[PDB]
Amino acid sequence: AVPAPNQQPEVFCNQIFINNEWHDAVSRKTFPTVNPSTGEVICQVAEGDKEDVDKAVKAARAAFQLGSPWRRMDASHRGRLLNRLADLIERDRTYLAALETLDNGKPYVISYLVDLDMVLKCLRYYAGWADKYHGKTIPIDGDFFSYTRHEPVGVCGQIIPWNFPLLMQAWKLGPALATGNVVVMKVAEQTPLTALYVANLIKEAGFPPGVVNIVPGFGPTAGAAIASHEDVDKVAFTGSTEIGRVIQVAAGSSNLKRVTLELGGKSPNIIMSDADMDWAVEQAHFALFFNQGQCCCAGSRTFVQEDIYDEFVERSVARAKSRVVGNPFDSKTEQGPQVDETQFKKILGYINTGKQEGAKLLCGGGIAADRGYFIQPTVFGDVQDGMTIAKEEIFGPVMQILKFKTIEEVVGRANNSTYGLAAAVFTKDLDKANYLSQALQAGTVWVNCYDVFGAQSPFGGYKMSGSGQELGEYGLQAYTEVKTVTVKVPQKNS
Amino acid sequence: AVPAPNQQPEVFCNQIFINNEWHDAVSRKTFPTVNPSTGEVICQVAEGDKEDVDKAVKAARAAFQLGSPWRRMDASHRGRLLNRLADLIERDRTYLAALETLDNGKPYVISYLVDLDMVLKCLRYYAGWADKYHGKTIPIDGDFFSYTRHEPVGVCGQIIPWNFPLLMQAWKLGPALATGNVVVMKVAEQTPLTALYVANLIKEAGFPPGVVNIVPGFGPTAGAAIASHEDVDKVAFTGSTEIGRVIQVAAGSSNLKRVTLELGGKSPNIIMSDADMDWAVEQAHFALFFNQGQCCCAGSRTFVQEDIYDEFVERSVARAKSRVVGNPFDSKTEQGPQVDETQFKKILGYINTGKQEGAKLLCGGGIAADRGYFIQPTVFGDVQDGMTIAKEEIFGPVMQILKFKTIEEVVGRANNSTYGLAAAVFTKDLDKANYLSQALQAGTVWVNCYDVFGAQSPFGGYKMSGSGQELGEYGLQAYTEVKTVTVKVPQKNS
Amino acid sequence: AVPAPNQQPEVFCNQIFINNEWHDAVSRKTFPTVNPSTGEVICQVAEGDKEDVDKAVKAARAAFQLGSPWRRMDASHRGRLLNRLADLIERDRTYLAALETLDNGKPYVISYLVDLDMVLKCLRYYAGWADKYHGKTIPIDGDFFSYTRHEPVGVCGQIIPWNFPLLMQAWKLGPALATGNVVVMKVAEQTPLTALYVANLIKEAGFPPGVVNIVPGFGPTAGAAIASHEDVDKVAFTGSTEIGRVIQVAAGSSNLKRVTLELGGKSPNIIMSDADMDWAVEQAHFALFFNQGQCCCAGSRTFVQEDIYDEFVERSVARAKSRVVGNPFDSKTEQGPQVDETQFKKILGYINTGKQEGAKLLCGGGIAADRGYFIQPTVFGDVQDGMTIAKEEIFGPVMQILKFKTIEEVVGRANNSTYGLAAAVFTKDLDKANYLSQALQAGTVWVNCYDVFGAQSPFGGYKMSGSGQELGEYGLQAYTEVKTVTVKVPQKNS
Amino acid sequence: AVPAPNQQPEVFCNQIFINNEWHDAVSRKTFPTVNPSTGEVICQVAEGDKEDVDKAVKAARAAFQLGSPWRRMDASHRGRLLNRLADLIERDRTYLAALETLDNGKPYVISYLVDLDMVLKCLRYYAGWADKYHGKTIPIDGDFFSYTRHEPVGVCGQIIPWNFPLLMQAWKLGPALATGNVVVMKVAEQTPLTALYVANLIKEAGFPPGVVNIVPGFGPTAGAAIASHEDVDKVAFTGSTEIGRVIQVAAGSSNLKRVTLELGGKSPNIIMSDADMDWAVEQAHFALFFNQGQCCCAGSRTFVQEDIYDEFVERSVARAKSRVVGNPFDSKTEQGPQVDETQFKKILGYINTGKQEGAKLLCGGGIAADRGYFIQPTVFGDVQDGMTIAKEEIFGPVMQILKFKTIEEVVGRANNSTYGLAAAVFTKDLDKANYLSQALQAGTVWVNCYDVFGAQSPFGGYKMSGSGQELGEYGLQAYTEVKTVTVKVPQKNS
């Protein structure tokens, strides 16, 4: 049941949001955001820079000041506000679902039923954490009373990617606002629209000004300015592992601000011989092709037991070949366009490599439309560990199927990586399930499923997949400062 | 590798322990504790009464007075004391292993390698909990500072059975002492020796007088006294499903003191068709025959799938037929005698019942010795739910094997009981394992194992199997009082 | 700013609520519920007995069936529904505020701005706990995977008082429904109306039938039946210190069900010489007189240091003499009538006793109106520890003001009580505030404030003040079953 | 009770510790360690470089290999070893305390009763954590079983400063080893000796080889090697606020490893007029002069209310004049030498700096002995906020006393700092303490005490005092990896 979408929704916000006010870039410069389906320009947006960031950072600090409305306000009320924002976004659910599809290109039915469901659940989840994250009282030695304060970290720099525009915004705002922090958020130049409108609903929710500031622009400028700002207490970056090094390097060189990173991966989806064929075939397909393959934890490495390899591939190629590519607003469409031309050509260049590298091209491999950034659902067979496509994150509709024999083999090959964001195991065996979920060096291991995220379930990565987690209770840690207060008492008793 | 035991351990203690001092029964009355292997008197024991109990409560009450050494005592020092006690106990491990065997009858190997092993770990485990059970600080509405204190409940009465004299003493003292309570313990008339000697080590450990008081005697008097005393803040009793209520009523009529209970069961052992036969066979035998059948969580109902019944049964009979019964001090001895004659004829009585009821006796079924309380390992086959041996806890080396076809059937038959202390499933299938562990109404579900107890692993029970928990972090709850302190402050800030 | 009250609200529910269906008593018997403002009979109400409780429990048990909608419901969905209930309550806030006044007598202004406010926040608070109450994974010894399940406890009997009809029901339902339990609630005969109407909203919110069953009636009939029921897993009773015991034996003598008690007290309010007169006096007045003095934790023992005693006493009388008593619906009315004649004659009888005992009657001491159950704000001075009025909870608008000299002294006298529900200390000294806050044997200690409850803050009592606590995260414990699942794994690694 | 020390303790360890083996530098290079009391060379010590570090890292990685002794080791057993290690350290308490003063310069009496006491307390505390850091089970939406695993981070690099050689080592090893990590530790060129001797005990303790590896040497070499190594999973650096920056970038450019920082401070000690003068003055002296001024959290900023300033100043200057400087092995000595010549000149330059700035030198201000790096207890008065001595951490026995008027004023002046490690308030008023403990922007606030550290008490910092904390349960956060495991289940039920 998905409400009919407005295929050309009108855009109301396209500037810089500061102190619950809409501003032009200081420079007066703007950038265009494009429809990835047509290549056409949707509209112009304010191009924020250092001076816009400072303005935003000045607004946040003063809103984070002791005695300020936001700082004094009940922890319970912060959650009421978060619930309100949830209420209003739901009110604007059909519109936002269409605008997200318009700028990002993901099919509307997904935008409505998945992305916007997940946004509502995440904000409502964190509303419930607002007054339920407690510090401790500590039975310290001697005649002393010791307790801890879990205060907000402060002015939080937040940079999010384009693959899940709205839900990334929610994943960040949730714990930061539930914990009493203020935010200056940097949104992706490819998909800044839905976040700019939500800032409107942030305003409509009742949130005081300066608590959430969004500065649209470009990474190296706005993004870098935040990463370098001397009055920013923490920066959360989600995006290319390349810029990540940039963020951490600038961060130590600015003020030693608190830095958490959530980068890419090359997630292994391991199908053991005793797996349910039909189910593993469909979850494997979803695992890689979901969101036009542009998922942090896409199952881009399909290991299949040799005894079943041929059948699995067969069904996967059949499955892949049936995937409907086209208008995201068309109910039948399973896959919309790639986010942008650069990414578009990047994936094509990967496929090209895969071919020359010797991987067996079984289907797709080229452009799926003369218009927009469409790429055919591509499946490579007989993929090797050394192949470029089997090592580098493609972030596209390119499926990699590797052949293995034993469980000891797949663990080492799966774990032989610089990444460790996610992984999955398909098997009926209890000991196989447990062996693997323990042995795989991943921040998330799915068993007989894939891409199952819960508002209560954390999402963190290992190795070069970064640090820190998202969702669940763990999220509140990186947005909180712990203060210990140890008071001298007349005489301690148990 | 077990050190040669003293088959004739000398007993140093047989009096009443109050305020780190040994007292004579106020009545001057004593009773004999007897070796279940020979049936002769070990020694005379002070027979505590109400008058001795009152002494103990008064001694305890004073040790818990605000400002006392124990109450002013550092939380971490509390752990050192239990850790010291552990260290003292290890020093006397060989001595204590002999004494427990002498009074209880369990093989010296098990006493040394199992029972005492878990005593050290329980005490060492809870020693680490002493200063790590935190209170909270709560982001309450209004300009207030709210935090909780986890205070000791106060004077705690503890009644423990005879099947695990030392381990039970440790399960109870573990959470009690680490969390700062004081204790008046009543030990089993059948097995008082090891507990009395341990009180002595507590003396040497450095525990302030009154902190632990032990009053040997019988239930209706001593036990009743603790249960009825109007200055007893808590009473922890483990044992008969019958007497437990007496506690709930006797205490619920006195001063509404805290009562948690850990009572008997009829725990079902479910063997699925795809389980490892050899493993299942040896585990099922252990699950029921462990500690001469004298276990609360004995797998007293072995459910076996039709497809594997015959082979499982055959394998079961030989294993039991091979089980070595005799002098507990014999290295080769697998099973000692029942704790006393009352138990011995009682179990004899049950075996008889099955025979009449039509259960197929497959082995054992009679007395294995003309001296001591030895009973033959016995196996009943083709057992049906409605039989008495399938309904009442036998607490002896009598095995019940039931046959089933579907998992939905065994779920219902397994759950159709007044008990719910534990349960087990043996299977290689993941989905069965998850299904059964969830569907089963038991406090503890073992999968592909049995009697797997962790000091860190909690021990609770459903229905009439008792309330409250033992072991793990959950144990400290029942021995802690939560006091909320709410403070007015100038101006509340996040 | 309170909306105009409807002094004669219509009654829409007055029967027995089972399976979201309205039923008459099996016997078809009914009882009258009275307006304490006129004494006149408001309406007739179904008189539930054992037979009706059998009905409800059978509906509850079936609602708790494994595979049932309530059992299968997303934990997050349980939270959505509690939020739905609060929303519908908010829509009917003015109505419920008026029916609560008519049935109970409490001032309309208080019912609206306090009672239903706290009702709404409590429900919204626990809605957020719904999917945040986690079990643990345990690093147990050996090659095992051990974790716990925090399952619902099951069929929960809830017997609630009349002093906070709506808040009490919300206080019980919140955590219970949040942990996935099903409820059979016994409401006060004096106050059945507002809770029955909520029953309508429970149905309207979307709760599956049989998840909540409310059987209004009388204690010895309805109440005892619940307390003795063999298929009830837990009984939560709140009220009379006398009746509480009936519960503990009835349940301990029934099926070993889990039993929580919430009984009265005689909470000491300690005012030190260096306290703020203005603040202390106004709080000391509030502490006892709130809700017509019918609060379990009312500060019925006012200790005032000798140096400030007289000035305080003088001011307290003036304050109470000025307290406006009358029509609860009048904005200027400060104190309405007592809940009923039973309570009415009871407290007069207590005033009588206090006179005979030699307590200094300083104001009031009699009837405040010829119609209804109004009693004058009463103040007794020079109260002594041995006096009846200083030992038994009056639950009326009767204030006791005692004299003391040292901080060492008031602690002994304050803790010299059978109860331990609440306490308070008023002072500007840090060491005095900490010293007393620790040494006071009460589940709740207020500093420079009184009756400060946060839904996030637990509410429990010491000694004979009952067990467990209400509100907070500790509130989820009493409605949870801990299941331990320990699984054998190929090879354990850190 | 202090045992007389060995004033010329023998050195038994002086090389590089890898896999429980003592090795020479690859280069065979050594460096001399100096006695800061005599200025003479104590002995030669192996000078590790990149190559020696690479060896240690591989040996660390090897001990962390899945299926290794340390990885298979029971969490509770991990605790036995830490408890064992502490035991061995206690046994060598007098020797290690002598060596620390010899190498560090702090008074033996303090080394013995403070540092080594604290070292023991840290180890035994974290021993009890080993098996108490639980993961959680999470009520995720859908038919799934979701849980998280808290695995070790891996190879943990630890660079420690010289002011608390043994205590700093413990603070790092404790949490690291309790959670199952392996260590490659860099000890200070000034104070490598006692840390090396412990390595010997670690072996006698029984830790599997490679679990802890200690590399003596220099910062630009060993430290930089560790921070840049591609196989070190996390780097924790403690020391110079300047160097702290170098680590974060090298780590950002190396392998994006986890980096926690603990830098310098300029902690404000705020004395209110109503504080206890005598207590305040002796604590204020201690707050700064402890450990020859060489504490990151030194009360280097003493704010005194104008009404009591003159007397406080009067009292503090005398107190310092009476402070004994000399041979740390002489019991009467309160203050030994600074750690070295670098530190020695640094403090002289700072004392000169304040002199030039116009700060009133009230006592000391020069060299205190011709031999070794002894410096006169120095007290500056009428210090202004803009002065360098009021802004930069001197890390010497140099006291700065500032004057203030109101509580709101000192709050802004105190918080106006790049540091936020600690703070303290002296007052008898409840509202002032609570107001200030909340408003002070510090990782740790003391009330009426200073330098009160408990193993159970977390130790972190605000602003440019670094990230992450030490001690408490919060100390384990940095040494833990969170893995979420999400399993498809037949049908989820509560």
UniProtKB/Swiss-Prot annotation, chains A, B, C, D:
Changing E481K: In AMEDS; allele ALDH2*2; drastic reduction of enzyme activity. Its main location: mitochondrion. CDD domains: ALDH_F1AB_F2_RALDH1. The active site is at E262 (proton acceptor), C296 (nucleophile). In response to mitochondrial stress, the precursor protein is ubiquitinated by the SIFI complex in the cytoplasm before mitochondrial import, leading to its degradation. Within the SIFI complex, UBR4 initiates ubiquitin chain that are further elongated or branched by KCMF1. GO terms for cellular component: extracellular exosome; mitochondrial matrix; mitochondrion. It catalyses: an aldehyde + NAD(+) + H2O = a carboxylate + NADH + 2 H(+). GO terms for biological process: alcohol metabolic process; aldehyde catabolic process; carbohydrate metabolic process; ethanol catabolic process; nitroglycerin metabolic process; regulation of dopamine biosynthetic process; regulation of serotonin biosynthetic process. Pathway: Alcohol metabolism; ethanol degradation; acetate from ethanol: step 2/2. Keywords: Acetylation, Disease variant, Dwarfism, Intellectual disability, Mitochondrion, NAD, Oxidoreductase, Transit peptide, Ubl conjugation. Pfam families: Aldedh (PF00171). It comes from the Eukaryota. NAD(+) binds at G239, S240, T241, E242, I243, G244. The record marks N163 as: Transition state stabilizer. GO terms for molecular function: aldehyde dehydrogenase (NAD+) activity; aldehyde dehydrogenase [NAD(P)+] activity; carboxylesterase activity; electron transfer activity; NAD binding; phenylacetaldehyde dehydrogenase (NAD+) activity. The modification N6-acetyllysine is found at K29, K50, K55, K136, K345, K360, K403, K405, K428. It is found in: Mitochondrion matrix. Its EC number is 1.2.1.3. Required for clearance of cellular formaldehyde, a cytotoxic and carcinogenic metabolite that induces DNA damage. PANTHER family: ALDEHYDE DEHYDROGENASE-RELATED. Homotetramer. Belongs to the aldehyde dehydrogenase family. This is Aldehyde dehydrogenase, mitochondrial. The gene is ALDH2.
